[PDB]
């Protein structure tokens, strides 16, 4: 399923043109883009939660060479499903 | 930002009631996690990908009869960031 995809399903079950679904999943994602943005966790009851997870800098290797290397700090996004969205997965 | 919140987001982006962008927000996980229900991955341009994991089935040991014990595999959610959720937090 992708984008296109899961905007029919919305038009479909919202009862909204398709570009009126268009508009709305558009919001949706980049509203979530957006609050990790600025460092907001998004809680989604009943889906799971975004956040953004801050690691730090730290020494690694590289898989083909076994070269030291410097990983730098970095900020990621980082989902996690809530029960409603693992039950039906498993 | 929970659920309430970002259903008031798409409905200012999104120009829409706060009954539609709720109906919006709702039909969008209620898709997601049907999709993955059904193994099928959700691949969504910039934000990223859900998906279904499987943790392999594996060996254990009963700690009280010291026999060995199968942990049957399982499924679970997994999400995998895209280039513009990344670029949007580094």
Same mark, same amino acid.
């Given at each position: 399923?992708?984008?296109?995809?899961?905007?029919?399903?919305?038009?479909?079950?919202?009862?909204?043109?398709?570009?009126?679904?268009?508009?709305?999943?558009?919001?949706? &994602? +980049?509203?979530?883009?957006?609050?990790?943005? @600025? #460092?907001?966790?998004? $809680?989604?009851?009943?889906?799971?939660? &975004? +956040?953004?997870?801050?690691?730090?800098?730290? @020494? #690694?290797?590289?898989? $083909?060479?076994?070269?030291?290397?410097?990983?730098?700090?970095?900020?990621?996004?980082?989902? @996690?499903?809530?029960?409603?969205?693992?039950?039906?997965?498993?």
């Amino acid at each position: 399923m992708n984008k296109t995809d899961l905007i029919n399903a919305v038009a479909e079950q919202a009862d909204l043109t398709k570009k009126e679904a268009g508009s709305a999943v558009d919001a949706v &994602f +980049e509203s979530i883009q957006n609050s990790l943005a @600025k #460092g907001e966790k998004v $809680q989604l009851i009943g889906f799971g939660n &975004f +956040e953004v997870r801050e690691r730090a800098a730290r @020494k #690694g290797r590289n898989p $083909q060479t076994g070269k030291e290397i410097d990983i730098p700090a970095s900020k990621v996004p980082a989902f @996690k499903a809530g029960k409603a969205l693992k039950d039906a997965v498993k």
